[PDB]
Design a binder for this molecule. Structure first.
Ligand SMILES: Nc1nccc2ccccc12
Ligand SMILES: Nc1nccc2ccccc12
Ligand SMILES: [Cl-]
Ligand SMILES: [Cl-]
Ligand SMILES: [Cl-]
Length: 163
């Protein structure tokens, strides 16, 4: 694992990450999708072979030797706040298992269910806190990728607050 495991945030395309593996904000059917998922499909299309997996799970498919961890967050348009919150926590716990199994020293990760699956709500804090609950026990360097300038500041602050 990393010598001093850290969290960092960068405002850039996750398809251009500098980490040993990537988490996709996938859909359950392994379709090219939108946003993060479409950028991952363009960069690592080979990783979508048998990538379909249920809501609240993660499935890893290799693009050459580069791992892509397909994590399926809930679409809060379809789920109740209560059940959606449970599936969103579960998807991140499955990401932590896969990162540990792969023995990577670093992982690039988006905030699950904060885009078209947000059901029109700001879910920065909800999603980021479930990311921390899952990843805190792992020793990989975690690099969170976002698009919005205000989200970059809020994620950076939330990381710094824990020290
Ligand atoms: N700044 C930034 N962050 C994430 C994705 C992007 C895609 C294309 C241009 C800029 C982007
Ligand atoms: N490509 C990409 N990378 C990071 C964050 C994103 C957010 C929204 C759209 C695309 C993104
Ligand atoms: Cl960019
Ligand atoms: Cl989303
Ligand atoms: Cl964003």
């Amino acid at each position: 694992g990393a010598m001093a495991p850290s969290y960092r945030v960068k405002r850039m395309d996750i398809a251009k990450n500098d980490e040993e593996c990537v988490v996709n904000a996938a859909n359950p059917r392994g379709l090219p999708g939108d946003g993060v998922c479409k950028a991952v499909y363009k960069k690592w299309p080979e990783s979508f072979k048998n990538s379909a997996t249920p809501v609240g799970t993660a499935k890893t498919v290799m693009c050459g030797t580069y791992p892509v961890i397909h994590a399926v967050g809930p679409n809060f348009s379809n789920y109740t706040e209560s059940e959606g919150d449970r599936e969103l926590a579960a998807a991140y716990r499955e990401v932590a298992k896969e990162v540990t199994r792969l023995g990577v020293n670093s992982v690039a990760i988006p905030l699950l269910s904060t885009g078209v699956y947000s059901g029109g709500k700001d879910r920065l804090t909800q999603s980021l806190n479930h990311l921390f609950t899952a990843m805190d026990s792992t020793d990989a360097d975690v690099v969170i990728y976002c698009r919005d300038k205000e989200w970059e500041k809020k994620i950076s602050e939330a990381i710094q607050m824990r020290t």
